[PDB]
Amino acid sequence: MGPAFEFAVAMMKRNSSTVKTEYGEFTMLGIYDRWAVLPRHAKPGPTILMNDQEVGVLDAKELVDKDGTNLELTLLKLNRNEKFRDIRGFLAKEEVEVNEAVLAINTSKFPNMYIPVGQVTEYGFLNLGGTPTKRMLMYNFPTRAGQCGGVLMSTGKVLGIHVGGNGHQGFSAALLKHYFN
Amino acid sequence: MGPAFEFAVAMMKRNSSTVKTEYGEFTMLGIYDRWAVLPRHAKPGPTILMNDQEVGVLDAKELVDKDGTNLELTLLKLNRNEKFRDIRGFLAKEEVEVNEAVLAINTSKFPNMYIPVGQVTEYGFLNLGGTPTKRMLMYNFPTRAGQCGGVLMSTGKVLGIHVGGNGHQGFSAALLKHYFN
Ligand SMILES: *[C@@H](CC(=O)OCC)[C@H](C[C@H]1CCNC1=O)NC(=O)OC(C)(C)C
Ligand SMILES: *[C@@H](CC(=O)OCC)[C@H](C[C@H]1CCNC1=O)NC(=O)OC(C)(C)C
C-alpha cells in the first residue's frame, strides 16, 4: 500500500481542499480547470468556503445515469482564477476495482488523514439512504461521518469520491473520465 | 513515506488496540508480554476496556526521568493470557529524529487512520499544559483531540506515543528501549 499512500499524499497535496457548505465540511477534489467535485449531499449553495475563503459557485451539475438514477456527485465550476492541475488522466472510463486502496480525507475534523480500506469492488446498485444509486464502489471499513468527499485512490488511480457508509462498509461514487469535458 | 505507511499498517495491525478508560478512548501499543503503554493522561484505573472487553490492570508505572520530571507515559501490565508480539527491537535507546514520519491512530473516532506528519525533531523540554515534561518529539501537524496514544513511526522504527498538541504542532513521548525490562 506504500505506493498508494505515496500517490495519495501527493494527490491530496496537489488537488484537494477543505470545503464548507451549509450542509457541513467536506473534502473537495479539483479535477481540471476550475471544476471540482463534491458528494451530492454537500448540496452546495450559490457560495462556498474553500480553505476558509468565500468562493463563488458558477455552475453545479448533480450527476445522473441516463435512466435518471442518482450517481451522487455534484460538479461545481468555481469563481476563482487559479486553475486546478488536470488529473483527468488519473480518472478511469469505468468503475475501477482493486485489492489495496487508500481513502484520503482533508477537513478540520480529519486533517490530512489516510485510511487503508483494502479491497474495493464495484458494487453498482445501492439504496443510498432511501435513494437508489448506481456506480458505487465498496470497501470494508468502519467509516465515520465527517469523511464524505474523501478521495478514494490506489497507485496511479483516482477511483472515486466517498459518499456513503454503514458500520464496516463505506461507499464511493466512481469518478469517471467522461463526466469531464 | 510509503515504506513508513507499510511498516505503520503492519505494526498497528499486529500490536495496537483501542482502549477506553474513565478519561477517554485511546490508542494502545502492546510492547512485549502483557505490558503495554498509554499516554499518562489516560490515567488508567484498576480496570480497562480493550477492544470492548473488560481487562484487569495488574500494575501501572507512570514514568519520570531521574530528576522526577514528567515523561508522560504509563506502563500497564495486563490481566490477560495472550502475549504481545515483542517489539522492543523496534524501540530506540534514545530520541529518534526523522524527516518522514507517520502517526497511526486506532479508536472509534479515528479507526485505523494514518497521518503523514513529516519532520520529527527531538524537542525535549515542553511545558505540557502546566507540566514540565522532557524527552518530547515534535512534528508540524494540526493535531486534534481523540489522537492521544497515537503511535509515531518511520520505516523500521517506533519513535513514540502521541501525548500533546496545539494547533499545528503535535508532541510524542519518545518510546525508549530501557523503559522495558
Ligand atoms: C458521509 C457524509 C458525511 O460524512 O458528512 C459530512 C462530511 C456520510 C456517510 C458516513 C456515515 C457512516 N459512514 C460514512 O462514511 N453520508 C451521509 O451523511 O449522507 C447519506 C446520503 C445519508 C449517506
Ligand atoms: C491528546 C489527548 C486526547 O486526544 O484525548 C483523548 C484521546 C491531547 C492533545 C491534543 C489536543 C491538541 N492536539 C492534540 O493532539 N492532550 C490532552 O488532552 O491532554 C494534555 C495533557 C493537556 C495534552
Place of cell 497515537: B150
Which of B112, B139, B154 has the most A C-beta neighbours within 10 Å, making it the best mutation to test the interface with A? B112
Q: For residue A41, which of A135, A124, A149 has the smallest C-alpha distance? A: A149
Strand partners, B48: B55
Query: B144 vs A109, B121, B125, B169, CA distance in Å?
Result: 8, 20, 21, 10
**For chain A, which residues make up each domain, given as ranges?**
1-15+85-181, 16-84
Measured CA to CA, the distance from residue A42 to residue A22 in angstroms comes to 8
Which parts of chain A are beta strand (E)? 16-21, 24-32, 35-39, 47-50, 53-64, 70-79, 98-105, 113-127, 132-140, 151-154, 157-166, 169-174
Asked if B157 contacts B92 with a C-beta cutoff of 8 angstroms, the reply is yes
Nearest to A98 by CA among A121, A115, A116: A121
Residue B107 CA: which ligand is closest? 2
CATH of A16-84, one of 3.90.650.10, 2.160.10.10, 3.40.50.300, 2.40.10.10: 2.40.10.10
Are B111 and A141 in contact (CB < 8 Å)?
yes
φ, ψ of residue B18 in degrees (nearest 5): -95, 130
CA distances from residue B5 to A178, B9, B17, B132 in whole angstroms, order as listed = 33, 6, 18, 32
Radius of gyration (C-alpha) of chain A in whole angstroms: 15
SS3 B3: helix
Calculate Rg over the CA atoms of chain B: 15
Alpha-helical segments (H) within chain B: 2-15
Active site residue B162: no
What does the block give as the cell for A139? Answer: 470497501
Q: Which residue type occupies B110? A: F
Query: Within 13 Å, how many C-alpha atoms sit on residue B50's CB side?
Result: 23
- Closest atom of ligand 2 relative to the B145 alpha carbon: 4
- Shortest CB distance from A2 goes to which of B5, B111, B141? B5
Write down the CATH number for the domain with range A1-15+85-181.
2.40.10.10
The answer to whether the CB of A146 is under 6 A from ligand 1 is: yes
Q: Which grid cell sits at B94?
A: 534514545
Note whether A1-15+85-181 and A16-84 share their fold. yes
